[PDB]
Predict the structure of death-associated protein kinase 3.
Amino acid sequence: MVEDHYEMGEELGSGQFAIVRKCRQKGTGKEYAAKFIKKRRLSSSRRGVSREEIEREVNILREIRHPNIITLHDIFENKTDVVLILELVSGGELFDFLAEKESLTEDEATQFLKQILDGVHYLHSKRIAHFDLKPENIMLLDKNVPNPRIKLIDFGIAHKIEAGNEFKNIFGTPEFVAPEIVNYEPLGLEADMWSIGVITYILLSGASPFLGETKQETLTNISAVNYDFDEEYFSNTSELAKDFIRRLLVKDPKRRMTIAQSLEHSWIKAI
Amino acid sequence: SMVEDHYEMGEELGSGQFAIVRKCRQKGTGKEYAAKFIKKRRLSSSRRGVSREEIEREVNILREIRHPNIITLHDIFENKTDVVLILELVSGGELFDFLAEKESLTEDEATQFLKQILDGVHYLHSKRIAHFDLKPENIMLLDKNVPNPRIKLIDFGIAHKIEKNIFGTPEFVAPEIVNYEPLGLEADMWSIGVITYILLSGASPFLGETKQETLTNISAVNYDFDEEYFSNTSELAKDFIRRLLVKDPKRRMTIAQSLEHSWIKAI
Ligand SMILES: NS(=O)(=O)c1cccc(-c2nnn[nH]2)c1
């Protein structure tokens, strides 16, 4: 029982069938975030989260030990919930911190981007695709210190990306498989690299590159790679910054820069 | 509970991915089952054992299913090293082996067995479960020594529940996600087409001399009905197969349509 081991406090937030509360561990006094994930009862139900999806997330969280990523401290389960005891991240969203400023220079921005890249480099080294990198999932540990530390959060749709042959072997031979299996192109780590390109674009310019009037229009823009570097937004942005973004916002995932290439890019190597 | 307190373990029946199957008997009823011992992956292990996620995925599917043409899960235990599934004992062997032993097999007899496969798949699809590994070796008989043997579909090791998807902002999502086309129930319908083609002819429609040829043949839907091998096969049967072996999953017969097709419905 979690309440026997942690003193539960205020609600901090809520997401997909989950409620996050602040807590404090009895005995140590250390503070954490307790994420209560509502379990799905019957497999036919669309409420809660299936046990297998909870496990997928927990298995990924268990592996993580990097300063730019949230960590898992403990786990409990009661009748209705799986309770993850996570690192407490209190500094808010990176972009909300940046909002307190009157302006932001390209060099100030790249300080933070390097941290995001370092976190993603760690994840990708373990074959973990986050799949929902966006500003809301880029938090700060503490926003009042001189050099705030980025924390990537929310592994709710993260997956480990198996080697390509691990898929094919499961069928024994291809004799009975359909064409959509033969031609199956799995989602991979490249998707996160795209997201990084979008994050960089907005971090530097304040503009969202693909946002349309409706979600459907945004999706059309993404699929067409319909963006530009208009001077109203990019007149104080370097050419190397634009090159970095261009090499990420590539439709073909196989032609996009990888995280290693991103870190070797001259724009990033310069600091 | 420990499994040994409830079941007498017997002889080894088979093996799976990090799994051993043993015959067993329930204490208190004397009824026989198959016990499948699946080795759990340790948190410090990379590749040994089966992941908890994959065990849970399959178990949650098995827990849901009850139908005469599908293997039944009777009990589950877990100890330090293994998850143990107590499954219905399916003893009659492969359908295709039983058929190969018949003096003669008529098209009408063939359709009656095919209809049982369709009944099982109709049930699975009604629960949004794609089997994804339908092939002769997963189509067994419960008991072969009866006048009309009952088909049992087995092996839910790669089966999945089937279901834009983005509840928050789409602004950061990659084009391959925006354009993602998940694998679906239609894949099982293709497999049924291939099974039917082999059932009637003994030939495989897409198999090539190498793996790449087989893959290429599937993708192009490059098959035909050889005059010799299909000389005793009705046009109505060929029509059934043609309406399943279709490249676009959206244009294949669904399970409901397959059961309504005159080849099945006429009998
Ligand atoms: N407290 S919160 O609203 O930012 C929130 C909501 C849902 C999930 C998380 C989370 N998941 N993994 N790490 N943090 C956080």
Notes: The pocket of U7E is lined by residues A 12-13, 15, 18, 20, 35, 70, 86, 153-155 (CB under 6 Å). Chain B touches chain A through 55 residues (CB under 8 Å). The first strand of chain B starts at residue 7 and ends at 16. The beta strands of chain B are 7-16, 19-26, 32-39, 73-78, 82-88, 129-130, 139-141, 151-153, 160-161.
